[PDB]
DNA sequence: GTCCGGCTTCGCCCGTAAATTCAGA
DNA sequence: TCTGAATTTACGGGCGCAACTATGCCGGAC
RNA sequence: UGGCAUAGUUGC
């Protein structure tokens, strides 16, 4: 479980954009298509993202460049089924 | 309160002046209301209800 | 969708664009069969099916019929949704005047027409006739004539002359109106006019009708010819008990305005005669203002049961309109509530949920659980399951509730503490276990109170939940930087019991081997765990670069300090355990680790503290008896000498030496004095109560006593309430805040007779209702402050401004209380602090002062520092993060974006209402002083004044004649150890740079009166003086002599008012004695209730008292009496008698001396010579035709305008008044508020500027607009060739303040929604809802918290 | 008490009040200032949107938490429409302008 | 039972506009 | 006899949050 | 099946 979030504050120095990383995380997670980058211990999609963070394998870049490599993946299969 | 004749002062918190007003109302069981009052210029006025 | 609100006067056309149908019949529903009327208020054909796609007659009852009308009654077939958006008209039989713009004061329509709003009143209601047209007559515009003048008019002018009556006239002027023509004659007219007040009336015509010109609107759409009328759906009908339906208001209202207008109508069709219809006329008029708004005209009228309708006004202004009932604070689904109890086994980030409602608020949870396990396919069944509470669904429960936080919230949410998320853990119980700890954040007791619990949804509100609103994150206040977690009451006792000594106990003086081998001894009944020991204790410093070194002594401790000291954690230094441990030493404690270690080690460190409390408070077994309150031996005869003191005083007030205030005040004054010393007695005697020995001599320690063993821990109580218990509890205050002199001598602990549970009643009565009836203000004072900062959040890092404000320590008059540590941490500095010994930069400019700069800065003694502050940023729209300084709530600077104005609000108004609602904590007892009457130096140091005009008298004392004298005790080192307040008329021992020492006194006065001395010697002179009418003389016939007493403006009479009584010293020839070196009499005035005990013609000398004035007395001096002074100061209320200032410098001169109203004169050495002052003669001056001036000089005495000193001294003498000024009464009532919130708060007082010169820019000349605005549009000027224009800043008050913003939003949800939705609709203002409060209406993101990237993202992409 | 989803109230759709009637407790003006005062807007979004007065936003929650996915769509409340029309039953014309 | 309609005063505080009263020319 | 400033008077807005229980909910013609 | 009024009460 989770008790204080304070390590990941400060891998993202700035309390808020914390929230939103978290968020996008467990969004991917839970809709979800991707999979936890952490070993799971039974923890909500939050907690893992969280405990992601503090590990220090995510964060607004790390994220940001994840999405444009499915991005371009997805368009390039669908260029290669189609054409 | 009881019916009668009673008579307040409204110290001072008019006028801006510290001037103790006087006013006496006679307040009926059954009725109208009647009030002398006073001003800063001490002139005695009346008032029904 | 949409990105602002416009607001205008809707005009006819716009009407019937909005309405799919006219209202005609005043008719809701036939009430034998339930559907709507055919074409009255709820009607089908104009506001849509009742049913959803479905015809009102039957005829089409499907989705497939979408769309069609059906023929045999007209009802578009359709969702019912729609009926709730479908508005009405209603075609008024005759015009008819919005009541709003007719009574808004300022009246629109009655300023548009430049008429007075009597007489448009008169117009309007059919009184009275006024002329359009009047042509070559007899008659002007907007003339009146009554019935006797029109009748004249029409037999003297019955050729083209129109003269008409009501509404109809009123429009007819209004259409009749060219105002951009008016515009120009009232613009050329201002130019060439001379009075001040017709220029006042002026402008506001002229911005009145440049504001109707700049919008759409036009003047005759404020009279009402279409009226709208609400869609069905929002003032429904629901059926009552019975066949009878909800008597609804706006119904009733619509349905007797479609009544007048019918009639009318119908009178107007058969040409009815001329009064019946103006009668009629009149009457719709008033339907119509009272469907507007009832009660605003007069005669509110009532329906059934005698209660006002809630007209529209009604229903969205107020506290039960919509803005503050329905759209600022709402009711929220997934909510529940219970009752609190304590639960001491949880941590602190987890609170105990019970196992009912855990499973009523996570329903849809538990379906989808359900459905994702397969154990339901269908919601139907998932839904039976969890109702039937099968022994599955509590598994998934335990599933679903791992990591899904819930938030907390207590009733009075003062501060943002009172709502904070927890990890539920399930419970089999009805009540919410809630962690001790947090309980003081709550001010959550366990006698009967409440908590609602709050369900986060979304994965962005759980993150926000567990990453800004759990309890572990919030270990610091928001409004200061101490704990808020520190524990209570319960385990600081179990604390203080643990670590303390007794000189004899079992195990004393054995070596120990370790903190484990002092429990293992404790535990085995060999050792007390009070009892001196030695302990090898190893503790680690962290001196070196993150690096933990250990240490290994021998510290002499005792077995409980050693047992506690294996929770400590590793970083803190031993010292920190080895004291006894009070409520405030463990405070320190836990701000200490969580300074040095961080934030998971203190929580961790605060759950082991509670835990080991709770347990050796167990174990301690500290009980309460009655022989604990043990009583004085001293009692008595205190109590014999204070009862001589008020008979002897009482003796003299009989011969008449003392007025009855004065000896009401000595005899307050000298029971104080006995409380006081009954209460050190009590203590003397309680806490060296214990003397043990059985190993030799006898020897004192501090007692065991139970009452003293928790009033020293700080645990419950403080010396007021233990004193109550055992000694004598003084004197109590009325609910007027009036101290009854009759004292009580009885504690509690004896009897308390009637007589004296009769006094008592009156403190209890007073604490009560402070309570209940003066927490109103503190509410209304918070509201207030969050309303006027609620928009001012934190956009940038850093502005690069140097300027900022000097922070030293202060001292009010007596020893420190802030020192400059608590006034300059965690707040960036403006310039580089220069060391005290030679121009060597001790920090550098831009660096954030943590406690290591402050230690560094005590160390070397630094007396001011200049920090940056909030209200002298450079940021537009918002504060960065360098000037408002430490967050207060993390040891960080603030985070871009976090909304530091609610957090200001929230911090300076929750305590008011917390010690308002805490008054009744001590009975009625009245807190007190002793009255001062000396001042004793307590240090060696040389003395020095300030604000000083003294005279030497006879017996060569020095006495201050000066108002605001300071006397600073000066440190050999120039630093100032000590200050006081020096009233006017005090003796001084010593004078000024004279060395004394510690322990003696350096002046002393009377405090009950002041006293008139002079400055000179001679006789004495009663002038302008008449016995009868300007003072009462009292005569003593048998001694020969008299005496006088001036009676004030109240008493004296009102024929020949302006006499002013004073003493004039004059020379034996009868000539006054000029004062030395000027040109002005030596007379001194005497005020109201002035007691001369002199005789006309009586020799004096200088340094004499002439008169002595009673001071009156002062009532309990506790908050409920001094958040009033609070709401004065952020009001920017002008005080009674303003002190007057120089507004520019230079000599000065006095001028003609008119008609005792004299004149002053400041000429500059080459500036603007010929300003001039009206100055009353009948005030004192301080400056006198001879010396230098610089501007924001006192030139009398008194209280200071805040707007004078804005004006004057600028923005940081203004701010730095406000914040010592409050925080002198919040430091009175021991409140402990961070300056920063303060000044942000003035910084939104002064957040308009008005314009002096034009300059280069697009301003008008006298106008007010947003400071911000003028200094950007006079940086883009600067940016460019042009000359920026030049302003004057305003200060306003709090509810000015937020009612005058751009957004017309916030200040409607504000007070006087009537007023500011007028003036919007009349300028046609439009609002980018880019506050919070415009956001929270609107129901979109706040750019403060994690919305502040959404706001940004979506400027950057607008 | 405890209340997930019950009854709204007609002439603004939010829950009823009271424990009689199966009602929601009160989010009140201090409790959004609290709110506020931390960084807390999506919490407060759906705690005075979704879980209040937004009959679209509230439907789709509620079904999203039961497809198991925790995300909303904001919504406009239906108060603030409210307080248009009641405004606009008033000579105001108050509306919301285009982007 | 079913259908239709227009006699209460009595609080404390403060801001602002209108009316009055000085205080002159 | 007029005219501006300051003073007085009249009058409109404000008067904390949350929660629970009960009763009563229109009076007059066909 | 939801509204208003009055009365009482609880926590501040
Ligand atoms: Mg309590
Ligand atoms: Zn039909
Ligand atoms: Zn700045």
């Not at chain 3, 680790?593 to 050796?616: E, H, N, S, W």
């Not at chain 3, 009692?635 to 009401?664: D, M, N, P, W």
């Not at chain 3, 003609?1152 to 009948?1178: N, Q």
């Amino acid at each position: 479980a989770r008790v204080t979030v304070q390590d990941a504050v400060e891998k993202i120095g700035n309390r808020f954009d914390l929230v939103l990383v978290a968020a996008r995380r467990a969004r991917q997670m839970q809709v979800g298509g991707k999979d936890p980058l952490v070993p799971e211990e039974n923890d909500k999609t939050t907690v893992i993202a969280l405990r992601e963070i503090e590990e220090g394998l995510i964060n607004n870049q790390i994220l940001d460049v994840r999405e444009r490599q499915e991005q371009q993946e997805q368009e390039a299969a669908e260029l290669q089924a189609v054409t | 309160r009881s019916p009668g004749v009673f008579f307040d002062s409204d110290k001072g918190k008019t006028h801006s002046s510290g001037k103790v007003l006087y006013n006496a109302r006679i307040i009926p069981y059954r009725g109208s209301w009647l009030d002398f009052e006073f001003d800063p210029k001490d002139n005695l006025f009346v008032r029904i209800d | 969708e949409f990105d602002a609100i416009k607001i205008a006067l809707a005009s006819p056309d716009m009407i019937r664009s909005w309405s799919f149908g006219e209202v005609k019949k005043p008719e809701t529903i036939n009430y034998r069969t339930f559907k709507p009327e055919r074409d009255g208020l709820f009607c089908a054909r104009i506001f849509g099916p009742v049913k959803d796609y479905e015809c009102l007659c039957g005829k089409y009852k499907r989705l497939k019929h979408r769309g069609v009308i059906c023929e045999k009654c007209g009802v578009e077939v359709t969702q019912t949704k729609v009926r709730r958006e479908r508005m009405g008209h209603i075609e008024l039989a005759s015009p008819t005047a919005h009541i709003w713009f007719l009574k808004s004061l300022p009246s629109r329509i009655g300023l548009l027409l430049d008429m007075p709003l009597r007489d448009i009143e008169r117009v309007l209601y059919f009184e009275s006739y006024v002329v359009i047209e009047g042509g070559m007559t007899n008659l002007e515009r907007q003339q009146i004539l009554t019935e006797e003048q029109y009748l004249d008019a029409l037999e003297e002018f019955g050729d083209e002359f129109d003269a008409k009556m009501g509404a109809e006239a009123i429009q007819a002027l209004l259409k009749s109106m060219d105002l951009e023509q008016e515009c120009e004659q009232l613009r050329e007219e201002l130019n060439e006019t001379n009075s001040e007040t017709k220029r006042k009336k002026l402008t506001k015509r002229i911005k009145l009708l440049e504001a109707f010109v700049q919008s759409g609107n036009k003047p005759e759409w404020m009279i009402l010819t279409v009226l709208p009328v609400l869609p069905p759906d929002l003032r429904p009908l629901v059926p009552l008990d019975g066949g009878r339906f909800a008597t609804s208001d706006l119904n009733d209202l619509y349905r007797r305005v479609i009544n007048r207008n019918n009639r009318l109508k119908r009178l107007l069709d058969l040409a009815a005669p001329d009064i019946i219809v103006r009668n009629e006329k009149r009457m719709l008029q008033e339907a119509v203002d009272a469907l507007l708004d009832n009660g605003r005209r007069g005669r509110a009228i009532t329906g059934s049961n005698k209660r006002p309708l809630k007209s529209l006004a009604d229903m969205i202004k107020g506290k039960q309109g919509r803005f503050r009932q329905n759209l600022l604070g709402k009711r929220v689904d997934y909510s529940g509530r219970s009752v609190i109890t304590v639960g001491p086994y949880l941590r602190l980030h987890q609170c105990g949920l019970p196992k009912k409602m855990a499973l009523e608020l996570f329903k849809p949870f538990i379906y989808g659980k359900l459905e994702l396990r397969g154990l339901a396919t269908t919601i139907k069944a998932a839904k039976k399951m969890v109702e039937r509470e099968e022994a599955v669904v509590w598994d998934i429960l335990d599933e679903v509730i791992r990591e899904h936080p819930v938030l907390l919230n207590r009733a009075p949410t003062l501060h943002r503490l009172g709502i904070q998320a927890f990890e539920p853990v399930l419970i089999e119980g009805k009540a919410i276990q809630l962690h001790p700890l947090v309980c003081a954040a709550y001010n959550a007791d366990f006698d009967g109170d409440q908590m609602a619990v709050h369900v986060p949804l979304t994965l962005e509100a759980q993150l926000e939940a567990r990453a800004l609103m759990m309890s572990t994150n919030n270990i610091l206040s928001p409004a200061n930087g101490e704990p808020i977690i520190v524990p209570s009451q319960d385990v600081v006792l179990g604390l203080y019991y643990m670590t303390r000594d007794c000189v004899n106990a079992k195990g004393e003086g054995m070596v120990l081997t370790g903190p484990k081998e002092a429990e293992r001894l404790y535990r085995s009944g060999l050792a007390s765990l009070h009892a001196r020991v030695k302990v090898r204790i190893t503790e680690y410093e962290k001196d070196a670069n993150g690096e933990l070194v250990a240490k290994t002594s021998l510290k002499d401790t005792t077995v409980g300090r050693a047992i506690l000291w294996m929770i400590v954690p590793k970083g803190l230094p031993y010292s920190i355990v080895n004291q006894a441990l009070g409520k405030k030493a463990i405070s320190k404690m836990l701000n200490t680790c969580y300074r040095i270690l961080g934030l998971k080690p203190t929580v961790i460190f605060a759950d082991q503290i509670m835990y080991t409390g709770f347990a050796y408070a167990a174990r301690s077994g500290a009980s309460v008896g009655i022989d604990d309150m043990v009583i004085p031996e001293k009692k008595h005869e205190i109590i014999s000498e204070a009862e001589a003191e008020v008979a002897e005083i009482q003796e003299q007030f009989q011969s008449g030496l003392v007025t009855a205030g004065e000896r009401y005040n000595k005899v307050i004054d000298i029971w104080a004095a006995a409380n006081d010393r009954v209460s050190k007695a009590m203590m003397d005697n309680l806490q060296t109560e214990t003397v043990i020995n059985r190993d030799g001599q006898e020897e004192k320690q501090v007692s065991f006593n139970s009452i003293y063993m928790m009033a020293d821990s700080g645990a419950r109580g403080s010396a007021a309430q233990i004193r109550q218990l055992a000694g004598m509890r003084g004197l109590m205050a009325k609910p007027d805040g009036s101290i009854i002199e009759t004292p009580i001598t009885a504690n509690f602990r004896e009897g308390l007779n009637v007589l004296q549970y009769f006094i008592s009643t009156h403190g209890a009565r007073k604490g009560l209702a402070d309570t209940a009836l003066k927490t109103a203000n503190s509410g209304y004072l918070t509201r207030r402050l969050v309303d006027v900062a609620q928009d001012l959040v934190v956009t940038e890092d850093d502005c690069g401004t140097h300027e900022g404000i000097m922070m030293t320590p202060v001292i009010e008059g007596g020893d420190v209380k802030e020192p400059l540590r608590d006034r300059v941490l965690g707040r960036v500095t403006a310039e580089d602090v220069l060391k005290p010994g030679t121009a060597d930069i001790l920090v550098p400019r831009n660096t954030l002062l943590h406690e290591q700069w402050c230690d560094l800065l005590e160390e070397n003694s630094v007396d001011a520092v200049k920090v940056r502050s909030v209200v002298s940023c450079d940021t537009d729209f918002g504060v960065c993060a360098h000037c408002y300084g430490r967050d207060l709530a993390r040891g960080h600077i603030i985070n871009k974006g976090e909304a530091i104005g609610v957090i200001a609000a929230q911090s300076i108004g929750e305590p008011g209402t917390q010690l308002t609602m805490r008054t009744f904590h001590i009975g009625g007892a009245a807190s007190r002083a002793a009255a001062e009457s000396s001042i004793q130096v307590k240090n060696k140091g040389s003395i020095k004044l300030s604000n000083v005009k003294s005279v030497v008298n006879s017996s060569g004392k020095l006495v201050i004649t000066s108002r605001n004298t300071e006397l600073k005790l000066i440190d050999e080192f120039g630093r100032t150890k000590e200050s006081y307040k020096v009233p006017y008329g005090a003796v001084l021992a010593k004078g000024d740079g004279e060395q004394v020492a510690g322990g003696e006194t350096v002046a002393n006065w009377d405090p009950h009166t002041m006293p008139v001395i002079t400055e000179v010697s001679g006789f004495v002179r009663f002038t302008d003086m008449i016995d009868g009418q300007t003072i009462t003389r009292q005569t003593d016939e048998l001694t020969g002599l008299s005496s006088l007493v001036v009676l004030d403006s109240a008493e004296r009479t009102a024929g020949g008012k302006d006499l002013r009584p004073a003493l004039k010293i004059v020379d034996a020839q009868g000539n006054d004695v000029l004062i030395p070196g000027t040109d002005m009499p030596a007379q001194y005035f005497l005020p109201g209730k002035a007691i001369v005990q002199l005789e006309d013609g009586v020799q004096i000398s200088s340094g004499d008292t002439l008169a002595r004035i009673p001071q009156e007395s002062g009532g309990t001096k506790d908050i409920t009496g001094g958040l009033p002074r609070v709401a004065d100061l952020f009001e920017a209320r002008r005080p009674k008698e303003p002190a007057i200032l120089a507004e520019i410098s230079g000599i000065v001169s006095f001028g003609k001396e008119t008609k005792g109203k004299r004149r002053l004169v400041i000429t500059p050495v080459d500036g603007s010579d010929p300003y001039e002052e009206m100055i009353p003669k009948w005030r004192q001056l301080n400056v006198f035709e001879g010396e230098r001036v610089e501007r924001g000089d006192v030139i009398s005495d008194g209280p200071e305008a805040p707007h004078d000193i804005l004006r004057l001294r600028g923005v940081h003498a203004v701010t730095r008044y406000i914040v010592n000024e409050v925080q002198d009464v919040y430091r009175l009532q021991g409140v402990k508020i961070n300056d920063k919130h303060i000044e942000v708060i003035v910084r939104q007082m002064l957040r308009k500027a008005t314009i002096v010169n034009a300059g280069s820019s697009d301003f008008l000349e006298g106008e007010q607009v947003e400071y911000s605005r003028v200094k950007i549009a006079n940086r883009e000027l600067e940016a460019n060739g042009k000359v920026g224009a030049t302003y004057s800043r305003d200060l306003l008050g709090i509810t000015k303040a937020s009612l005058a913003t751009e957004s017309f939003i916030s200040a409607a949800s504000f007070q006087e929604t009537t007023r500011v939705l007028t003036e919007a609709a009349v300028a046609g203002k439009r609002d980018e809802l880019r506050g919070l409060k415009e956001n929270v209406i609107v129901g979109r993101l706040i750019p403060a918290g994690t919305g502040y990237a959404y706001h940004q993202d979506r400027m950057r992409r607008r | 008490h405890a209340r997930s989803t019950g009854s709204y109230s007609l002439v603004t759709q939010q829950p009823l009040g009271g424990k009689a009637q199966f009602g929601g407790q009160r989010f009140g003006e201090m409790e959004v200032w609290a709110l506020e005062a931390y960084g807390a807007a999506y919490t407060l979004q759906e705690m005075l949107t979704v879980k209040s007065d937004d009959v679209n936003g509230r439907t789709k929650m509620y079904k999203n938490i039961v497809d198991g996915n925790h995300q909303m769509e904001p919504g406009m409340p239906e108060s603030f429409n409210v307080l248009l029309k009641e405004i606009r039953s008033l000579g105001i014309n108050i509306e919301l302008e285009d982007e």
